[PDB]
Write a protein that binds this ligand. Structure first.
Ligand code: HEM
Ligand code: HEM
Ligand SMILES: Cc1cc(N)nc(CCc2cc(N)cc(CCc3cc(C)cc(N)n3)c2)c1
Ligand SMILES: Cc1cc(N)nc(CCc2cc(N)cc(CCc3cc(C)cc(N)n3)c2)c1
Ligand SMILES: C[C@H](O)[C@H](O)[C@H]1CNc2nc(N)[nH]c(=O)c2N1
Ligand SMILES: C[C@H](O)[C@H](O)[C@H]1CNc2nc(N)[nH]c(=O)c2N1
Ligand SMILES: [Zn+2]
Lengths: 403, 403
């Protein structure tokens, strides 16, 4: 066959050849000797990255080689020459931002990539203004439960000058209080960050679901702390359809999944503060956040209520419970009329996504372990899809925690 | 150079130093990760792969440098020098067999790698004799239901001649009969193989669980059809603790998972027929075999007996039903007194295996996407554990289909 990787679907029996990977300008962790695919974390150089993105842009508008294409090129090196950086045009930001989401090997919601609201915030001057900008994002994106994908782009990393940073990892997060015995009250994922807000004068609450304040950082200034108006932070009380007691557990989650600690890289430019929001997939809440032994860990609690034999694994008690918990998440979101998507619908649309991208780009970089859901793995069609994972740009990046 | 493997549940960290002993290549390159591909589209070497294997053995029994070691190495040099190949001593073979399993990155059951009965069938000359071995291996491994891991090793490949092969992928397989309706009564995975048997003379039944005969091949001979005496094959009808209608589904599965299509490499000699068997981990039966859309596919049926809401995905009927089916399997096997391990027990013992091998060898190759079971991934400790994949020798390979 062809000299690009072959890509079977073992359910349908279909084949495809990924030609997109040939565009990757970035090494990953794997080598012919060993595969590190399962690891979570893995000047002139600018000019040529910049040139690259511009060609992408111009091709995306079908003008590859034309007078405006080669003038914008002339223009970009003119800027770099005399300053070391350069700036994106309004629509260039829009394209590159969409291109980063499109390129994200670990997101399963990519079928939605074309529809995303790019909120330009490169005019932002202070931590106060950051907050305001953000409050607007949450309001738009949340849209009273009929959610809408968006990203707010704050300004970009500069030579020897501070970064714009959101200290929190998500915009909405529950507190995590280290107890004087050893336990954690709240979300254990958010211990450190809780511990940092108090250190910067936050008065902590008491409960399993205390919404955290925002730690925003303007360049060179210390981080300023900001409390989200409660009316802004839409939450969903959880309850089971048929199990009447579930509602009494006092469990809950928030509507807006919005990542705030990732780096948005476009054509060499680095946007250190550019939080994006979508909507949740049922399992993120119900299988990861609530049942991970290192998170809310509510599996044993709920199985006791369901009255299952937890003295032995053969009872598949863990399984059973997880399913009801997931279902409680779905029903409860649907009932409160807030956008959500179960793992079956989500994966079925990712299949359509992969088919769409084959036609258009000749490939789609996918992180299999990440695309396949944390329950009911082989029941979703993606589990039977072989997947190439490589790094394309524009991209999102992990970046060091600022403190 | 040496990779940092993390567990995210516990925050614990290791470094893998074992991967440096890998001499073979994998699919990944630094440009793109192919870890998810199921299979790989892929006088002097033998001398060095032997020396280095023989080295392992003597090092493994503490006599590394001794009389017997020195003198065995010269046995090999002399045997390859005159014959272009050499032969293994039975102990040496027993060692290799145990090791190749130990190295199988996609095997979750490797906690047991030390406990393996090894049948030396290297003095086989007829498909007749093969069938006696195969029959005897089964009678041993099954043990009235108290299963015991085994491998039986037919003659090594040789350059002047064709291989000893078993045509079946497993020693026990249900026939999949094709039908005018574009339908498949029986197991869809065994359609091609059922048709071969027919072509080769066997009378077919027309049940959903018709145990297939064996097609055995001595070098350069036409394959031959041997039937397994019904009694040797242990089956388990499936019932369900709570639900009485389940058994009336007439579902059933066989006790012994025994792979017969793979090749065993040791000291660079190739063992083309070398079946091996252990015991089932329940998900293989209740999830993949019984619910794969391209297999027996009972998910809809079952669910409809359960009177669930098939009409939409968000009722989580696919998951709900999957679980009952997995549960049905465990109960049935525990009831019929037949070795089985559920995904919870197993992955736990594998986490122990990782730890044992960590101290013993400084690592352990593992294929994350095959170790994490096909339901309730995140609910098993493996999900949260980083894993390095690489090719250690002795090893099982895939090989072409003989026909
Ligand atoms: C529209 C609804 C969306 C859904 C249902 C969705 C789904 C998901 C899920 C389930 C994950 C795995 C996260 C985890 O389990 O830890 C993920 C990862 C990711 N998604 Fe989305 N996503 C959506 C929207 C978005 C949007 C709007 C963006 C960017 C604007 C985005 C970019 C990403 C990125 C960069 C990752 C990988 C981040 C990481 O490495 O932690 N997704 N997606
Ligand atoms: C003893 C109890 C055992 C258990 C519970 C077990 C479990 C498993 C499971 C669940 C798989 C995944 C295969 C799939 O779902 O398609 C697997 C793969 C594998 N196991 Fe085991 N195993 C056991 C014993 C053995 C033995 C005795 C051997 C060899 C002597 C072995 C070697 C392998 C190999 C080579 C694979 C890869 C299969 C392939 O690539 O097609 N295991 N094991
Ligand atoms: C701190 C940290 C570092 C790291 N390397 N990995 C993790 C776990 C993965 C993860 C990380 C973040 N920051 C956000 C999500 C929500 C995922 C999400 C985002 C969007 C936009 C929509 C959606 N449905 N889900 C998931 C955390
Ligand atoms: C035909 C074929 C080719 C190919 N490349 N891949 C597959 C799927 C993987 C598979 C193949 C076979 N032959 C047997 C099992 C049972 C796995 C098993 C083995 C043992 C020894 C114990 C156990 N519990 N489970 C799994 C099938
Ligand atoms: C395409 C995908 O990698 C493939 O379906 C894998 C996934 N994980 C698996 N895990 C096991 N144990 N066995 C399998 O056959 C598979 N199939
Ligand atoms: C080690 C392993 O890769 C890790 O546990 C991954 C598995 N898949 C995941 N998938 C998602 N979406 N999020 C995660 O945190 C993880 N964890
Ligand atoms: Zn890889």
């Amino acid at each position: 066959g062809p000299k690009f990787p072959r890509v079977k679907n073992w359910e349908l029996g279909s084949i495809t050849y990924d030609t997109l990977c040939a565009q990757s300008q970035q090494d990953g962790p794997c080598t012919p000797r060993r595969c590190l695919g399962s690891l979570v974390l893995p000047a002139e150089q600018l000019l040529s990255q910049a040139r690259d993105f511009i060609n992408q842009y111009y091709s995306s508008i079908k003008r590859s080689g034309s007078q405006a294409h080669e003038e914008r090129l002339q223009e970009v090196e003119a800027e770099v020459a005399s300053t070391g950086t350069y700036h994106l045009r309004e629509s260039e930001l829009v394209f590159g931002a969409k291109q980063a989401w499109r390129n994200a090997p670990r997101c399963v919601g990519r079928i939605q990539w074309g529809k995303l609201q790019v909120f330009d915030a490169r005019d932002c001057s202070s931590a106060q203004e950051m907050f305001t900008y953000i409050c607007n994002h949450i309001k738009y994106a949340t849209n009273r439960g009929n959610l809408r994908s968006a990203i707010t782009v704050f300004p970009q990393r500069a030579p020897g000058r501070g970064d714009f940073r959101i200290w929190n990892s998500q915009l909405v997060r529950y507190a995590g209080y280290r107890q004087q015995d050893g336990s954690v009250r709240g979300d254990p994922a958010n211990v450190e960050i809780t511990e940092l807000c108090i250190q910067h004068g936050w008065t902590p609450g008491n409960g399993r679901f205390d919404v955290l304040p925002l730690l925003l950082q303007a360049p060179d200034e210390a981080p300023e702390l900001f409390v989200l108006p409660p009316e802004l932070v839409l939450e969903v009380p959880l309850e089971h359809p048929t199990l009447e007691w579930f509602a009494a557990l006092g469990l809950r989650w928030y509507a807006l999944p919005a990542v705030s600690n990732m780096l948005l890289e476009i054509g060499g430019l680095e946007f250190s503060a550019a939080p994006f929001s979508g909507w949740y997939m049922s399992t993120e809440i119900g299988t990861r956040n609530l049942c991970d032994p290192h998170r809310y860990n509510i599996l044993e609690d709920v199985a006791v209520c369901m009255d299952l034999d937890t003295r032995t694994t053969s009872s598949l008690w863990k399984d059973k419970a997880a399913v009801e918990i997931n279902l409680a998440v779905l029903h409860s979101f649907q009932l409160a009329k807030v956008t959500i998507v179960d793992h079956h619908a989500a994966t079925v649309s990712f299949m359509k996504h992969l088919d769409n991208e084959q036609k258009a780009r000749g490939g789609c970089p996918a992180d299999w372990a990440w695309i396949v859901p944390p329950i009911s793995g082989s029941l979703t069609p993606v589990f039977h899809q072989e997947m190439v994972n490589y790094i394309l740009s524009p991209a999102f990046r992990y970046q060091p925690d600022p403190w």
